[PDB]
Amino acid sequence: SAICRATTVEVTLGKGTGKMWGELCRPAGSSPDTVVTMVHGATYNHNYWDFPYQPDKYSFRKMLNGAGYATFVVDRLGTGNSTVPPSSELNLTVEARQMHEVVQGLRTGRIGGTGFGKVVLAGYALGSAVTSIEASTFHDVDAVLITALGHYNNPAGTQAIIDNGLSPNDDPVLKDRHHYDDGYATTKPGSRKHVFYADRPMDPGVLATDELTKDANVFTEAADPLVIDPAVSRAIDVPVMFALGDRDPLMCGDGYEDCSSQAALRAQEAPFWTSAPSFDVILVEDAGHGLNLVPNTRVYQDASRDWLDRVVGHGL
Numbered sequence: 001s002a003i004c005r006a007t008t009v010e011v012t013l014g015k016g017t018g019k020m021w022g023e024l025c026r027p028a029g030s031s032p033d034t035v036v037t038m039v040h041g042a043t044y045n046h047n048y049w050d051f052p053y054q055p056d057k058y059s060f061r062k063m064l065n066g067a068g069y070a071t072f073v074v075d076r077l078g079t080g081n082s083t084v085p086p087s088s089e090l091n092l093t094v095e096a097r098q099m100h101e102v103v104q105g106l107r108t109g110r111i112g113g114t115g116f117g118k119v120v121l122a123g124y125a126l127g128s129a130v131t132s133i134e135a136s137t138f139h140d141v142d143a144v145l146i147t148a149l150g151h152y153n154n155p156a157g158t159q160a161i162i163d164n165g166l167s168p169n170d171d172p173v174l175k176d177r178h179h180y181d182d183g184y185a186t187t188k189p190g191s192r193k194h195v196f197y198a199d200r201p202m203d204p205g206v207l208a209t210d211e212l213t214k215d216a217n218v219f220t221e222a223a224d225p226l227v228i229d230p231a232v233s234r235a236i237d238v239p240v241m242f243a244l245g246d247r248d249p250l251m252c253g254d255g256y257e258d259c260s261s262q263a264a265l266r267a268q269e270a271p272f273w274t275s276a277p278s279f280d281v282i283l284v285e286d287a288g289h290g291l292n293l294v295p296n297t298r299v300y301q302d303a304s305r306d307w308l309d310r311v312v313g314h315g316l
């Protein structure tokens with residue numbers, strides 16, 4: 001009981017133009033004023049935000065639709081059903097302009113027909129960096145949901161990704177789709193378990209589904225200084241939820257992102273969100289880096305939902 005229409009969006013790409021794939025979903029028998037736009041992270045695609053194994057439990061999109069909200073999960077360019085351009089043409093700032101265009105199109109009704117009054121941007125990992133830049137540059141979103149991306153980080157976590165990297169032309173899952181140039185990457189088979197999820201308890205079906213729905217990415221975007229720039233996040237003048245897993249191998253550690261308690265995390269990040277009228281923080285126990293895909297994810301889902309209800313509402 002949820003209406004879902006897949007569509008493509010004409011999006012800026014140097015000269016112009018390229019195709020961004022996205023799915024718009026509305027709760028059955030309902031027409032909400034609020035849409036939540038969901039930008040996935042690196043090496044993932046839209047499936048992260050609409051996960052297809054036990055969706056009742058792990059699909060964040062679905063949870064949102066059940067809460068009354070409209071949702072727009074996208075395939076970032078380079079991934080899934082979207083255009084896969086030359087890696088040189090793509091970077092975070094370019095990608096944020098693309099997201100601005102998706103927002104723009106959801107507000108006016110170009111995307112979806114009805115046209116939404118409130119737009120929420122939701123971000124996972126480097127999608128949160130895309131989200132932040134969009135929010136900072138254009139100021140055309142009513143609230144921002146930041147996940148799996150902190151201002152401090154762990155070099156060794158990042159290095160493990162580099163030590164488990166390979167080219168998507170050598171990867172059995174991604175071989176057949178495209179001929180990717182030398183600036184696209186993905187992760188090795190069997191590596192995600194450790195490099196993202198930290199070896200924490202997971203459903204075996206979740207790990208298998210993750211490796212079967214994984215994607216490529218443009219790996220220069222990870223080294224971008226904009227990912228951790230304080231100037232970007234400090235400029236955000238709307239309500240922000242900041243979500244992080246307490247065993248995230250890319251952030252957490254002594255002398256890095258303080259994942260010892262929620263209050264400590266809150267303390268350490270607050271100097272980076274000073275224009276936000278409200279700054280809320282959830283810290284997900286025994287969780288790695290993919291928050292939607294952990295066994296106690298529902299704690300994270302309920303909090304996110306309750307926040308939305310509090311800072312935007314789903315309209316009428």
Ligand SMILES: COC(=O)c1nc(-c2ccc3c(n2)C(=O)C(N)=C(OC)C3=O)c(N)c(-c2cccc(OC)c2O)c1C
Nearest residue numbers: 041042125126153161162165166185186219222227228250
């Ligand atoms: C799913 O998580 C990510 O989007 C992600 N991927 C990665 C990631 C993913 C794939 C790759 C790489 N990094 C990478 O560095 C590299 N050389 C590759 O080539 C093999 C990758 O495929 C990240 N490094 C980072 C990252 C983490 C902390 C701080 C950062 O910058 C200040 C980050 O960019 C993130 C957040």
